[PDB]
């Protein structure tokens, strides 16, 4: 409606997407979690194992609060991603780019929290040669920050989902974990932070 | 003619098409159906279905009319969807991005009505198992809003259509059945509508 | 060319590309050709044919006219399409994008007459079971404006062409008829005219 | 370094990448020659060639020259092609879209001259049949400009030799030809020029 | 942050991404290093390498520098590479358009040192035809400038890695080197630096 187009108006004034929205030099938390949809497929000679997954993304922008009372009825909007900040998260093991399934849109409300929540179909490198065994493959999906450390970027899961799993796959899915890392590298003093979704699962039958 | 230009100039001037073009507190409402023109491929080992599909989606926007009598002759224009408005429909099951095979355009005329037409290919999870199967194989086509609840975007499905599919592919679609549901989530407040298009199909050479 | 650069200068002010150039009524009238070029493959157990071939499309946009005495030496320039005013044709029953082989420029003279003439590959929903009978196989392709009616956007064929068939694709050429068809649709009033181009091939081996 | 910076601001102040750069009726002369890289692949069943090839592309942009003693030090910059005229030069008997594989930047020095000098990756309509034998198989890769003729885009070529063919391919060469024509057409009033280079190869062994 | 978002202002307004950062008499010192993390496939018959692995580059771009206290708390920026002047080096003997996989930001200090380290995923011309042997097949990934000479970017190498390399990919990575050097083209009086990166692998037994 013409509030939100008018909130429009003023919120993009002087918003840069290409800056990192800390305040205070305090770092920018944001919550990450992966659920699992479906195993698509995977490539035991080239190691390689091909899934689509919900990421569920959320993290706080001051720079895109309002009060609801100067804009009565607009309690969250539905904004492009390309016209706002967001984490720059890599898939550290990923061979191929994401194929994105879901409209590019996040949700912002008046507090300036956007939530993120693409579908997405990738490929990452595995050692998929249990995939038969009882035991299964086991596969790591590594994601974090490519640009930010800790400091900059809080990067925090949240509670992990199989619920959205499609039943009728011919891999069965045994056990999915979840972790927080922090990694030193050589260059710099402060951490990197990563996420780590550990997925087994094995052929039925 | 001279007078589309000046409606163009009209129509552009204080007009976001990142907006959603409610008015008064109510919801737009958005008619929404699928016409299956053609199942392209099942892969029974990955469970997929690649369909080739219409979607007739239609819908209102109040900022988007103007009055015949100043611009004579103009009763309609024809508007790349970057200029407007457009619903964030999703394939909830889709695992491939959409590939819109038609001109991206939508019809617009003087009192806002909108009509995007797009035909699409797209790949779904689906269980294909029973393809070779008297009863067939059974996939939903789910489709919703993204991201706009029941009171913003209120999604509405009209009468499909199944006179569009090929009668020459290897797959002969048995029925097809459309339903609009609408739950709440427990993460947000306000509950959600999607359409799902319900497609019974099985291989013509099954036997 | 310092009055071609004028004439870009001038032509562009007032241009608005996503307004059909109709005037006074009057509908434009598009010229529509279309010369296959190569039978790519076929796939009998999809349904599909894959092809290349050329179309040539021209129509008048008299907002694009000059006086040459005004730009002399300037009698036609080479013009990027994205900058113009083009038909929204569409393949009917194509079942995947068209890739455009060649430079996506069209040819305008003083008199706002557009020539657009992309080569094309793509393919199309087609049953070619027969396509190694004696018979053949016979595939439509069929064109039309998505949301110009008659009144509006006047297609029109013209010459069948069959002389850039290569000569040593595995496909032997029968014949390509072509007709123009005005349908009639529930929704409208106007009808929408469509041109299709009916291919019949078969294996010559 | 600044005095290139400086000349940027010059240069493209009226500058149009859109318009040919002709100049007192005379065309703009384009120098072209093809180096074959490597043959990637042939499909016999669908008539097609894949080829890596190095075009050696120069020509005059009268627009954009300066005094050397004006900006000293700058002999030569290097600039995007997106920002400057370049020739529309297709590939007649392409079935693919060009694969550029190297940066897309060309050498502009301060008399106008420039250089575009890309590697390629694309596929070809071939009669590859006769590959396995001892006269090999023939392809004619044939370019040109797409929309301008003669008098406006002089085309012709330079020598090229088959010095980069690599060594370990699967394919030898058996003879290459490169050869510049002109010919009429349907359309035209006007002879349009295209270079061809034609290739005959084989299968080692 | 409010200081981030003044100095990308007041960066935005003098730079210009096309114009390379060199001073009378220095050029830019580029650093370049490649970790080679996954051989994906070989094509034994085309000659063809398959691989991802982890470019490091560095140089100072003095024209991105400010100074800390206009600008207290930060230290350095995450900034997308599109923005930024990049050195346009060529994989020599790539067959394929790089694959980036990672985000395409650089981070930028205050003295205007770059660092961008993308991951990529591209495929080489290779011979091939001794991965099944003793002394496996040995691939040179080339790298260099396509167009700056020495004079204007100094490519340098350092330290390589194969520790990212996956231990569970079926080929056995059996060497790796790296050389600097500098050659001469007839058409230049300057020579043009690269770096090549020679990697010796084997299927595993
Ligand atoms: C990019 N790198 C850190 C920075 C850094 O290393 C670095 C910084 C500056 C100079 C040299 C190296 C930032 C956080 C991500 C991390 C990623 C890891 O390297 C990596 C690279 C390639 C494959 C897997 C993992
Ligand atoms: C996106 N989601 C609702 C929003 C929401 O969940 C949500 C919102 C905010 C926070 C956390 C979750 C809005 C309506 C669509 C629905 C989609 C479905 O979840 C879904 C997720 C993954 C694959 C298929 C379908
Ligand atoms: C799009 N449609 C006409 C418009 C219209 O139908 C229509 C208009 C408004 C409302 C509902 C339907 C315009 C001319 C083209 C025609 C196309 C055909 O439907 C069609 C759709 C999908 C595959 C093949 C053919
Ligand atoms: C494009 N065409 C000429 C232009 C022209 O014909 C033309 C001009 C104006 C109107 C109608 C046609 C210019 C020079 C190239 C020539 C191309 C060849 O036809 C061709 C067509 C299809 C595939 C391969 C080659
Ligand atoms: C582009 N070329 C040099 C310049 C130059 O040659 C050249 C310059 C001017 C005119 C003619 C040729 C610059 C440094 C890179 C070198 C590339 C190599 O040729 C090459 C070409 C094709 C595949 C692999 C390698
Ligand atoms: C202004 C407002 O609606 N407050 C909410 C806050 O309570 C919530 O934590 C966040 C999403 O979790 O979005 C905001
Ligand atoms: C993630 C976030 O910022 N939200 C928190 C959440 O713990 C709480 O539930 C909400 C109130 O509903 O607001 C606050
Ligand atoms: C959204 C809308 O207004 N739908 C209209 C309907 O009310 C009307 O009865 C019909 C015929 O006039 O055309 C359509
Ligand atoms: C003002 C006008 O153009 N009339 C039509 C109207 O009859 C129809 O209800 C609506 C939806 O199709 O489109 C408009
Ligand atoms: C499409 C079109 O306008 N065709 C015209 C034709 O009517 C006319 O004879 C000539 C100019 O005299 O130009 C051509
Ligand atoms: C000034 C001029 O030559 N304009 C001609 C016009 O007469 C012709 O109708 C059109 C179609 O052929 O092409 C052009
Ligand atoms: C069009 C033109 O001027 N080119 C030639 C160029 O090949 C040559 O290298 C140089 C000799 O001075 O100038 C001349
Ligand atoms: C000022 C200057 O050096 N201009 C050169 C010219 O000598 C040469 O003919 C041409 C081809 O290299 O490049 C340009
Ligand atoms: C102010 C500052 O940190 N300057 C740094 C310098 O210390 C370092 O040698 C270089 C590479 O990291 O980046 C620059
Ligand atoms: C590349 C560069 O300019 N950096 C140098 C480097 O030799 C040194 O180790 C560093 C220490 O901070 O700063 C300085
Ligand atoms: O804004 C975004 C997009 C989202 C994509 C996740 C991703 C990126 C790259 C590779 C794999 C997955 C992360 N943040
Ligand atoms: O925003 C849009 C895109 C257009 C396409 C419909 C679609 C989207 C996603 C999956 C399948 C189909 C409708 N509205
Ligand atoms: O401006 C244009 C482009 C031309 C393309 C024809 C086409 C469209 C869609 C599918 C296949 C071919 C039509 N008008
Ligand atoms: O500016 C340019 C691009 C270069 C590409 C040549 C080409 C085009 C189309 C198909 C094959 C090769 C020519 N001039
Ligand atoms: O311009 C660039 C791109 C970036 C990546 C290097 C590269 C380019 C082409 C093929 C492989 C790798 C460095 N500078």
Redesign the interface.
């Known amino acids: ?1 013409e509030f ?2 008018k909130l ?1 108006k003023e919120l993009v004034k ?1 918003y ?1 997407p ?8 305090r770092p920018v938390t944001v919550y990450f979690s992966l659920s699992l ?2 195993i ?2 995977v490539d035991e ?4 194992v091909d899934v ?1 997954f919900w990421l569920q993304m959320s993290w706080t922008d001051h720079y895109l609060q309002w009060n609801v009372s100067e804009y009565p ?1 607009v309690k969250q ?4 991603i390309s ?1 706002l900040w967001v984490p ?4 550290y093991n ?4 994401p ?5 590019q ?3 912002v409300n008046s507090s300036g929290h956007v939530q993120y ?1 693409p ?1 997405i ?1 990738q490929r990452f ?1 595995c ?1 998929v ?1 249990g995939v038969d065994t009882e035991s299964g493959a086991t596969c790591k999906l590594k994601f974090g920050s ?3 450390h800790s400091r900059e970027l809080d990067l925090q899961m949240q509670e992990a989902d199989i619920s959205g799993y ?1 039943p ?3 891999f069965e899915l045994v056990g999915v974990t979840q972790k927080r890392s922090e990694r030193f590298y050589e260059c710099c003093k402060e951490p990197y932070p990563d996420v780590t979704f550990t997925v087994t699962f094995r052929k039925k039958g």
């Open positions: 409606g939100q187009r429009y002087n840069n290409d800056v990192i929205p800390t305040q205070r030099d949809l479906q698509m497929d000679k080239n190691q390689v689509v009825g909007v539905s904004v492009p016209s720059d998260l890599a898939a990923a061979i191929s780019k194929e994105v399934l879901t409209p849109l996040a949700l929540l579908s179909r490198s050692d040669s490519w640009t930010h499609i009728y796959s011919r």
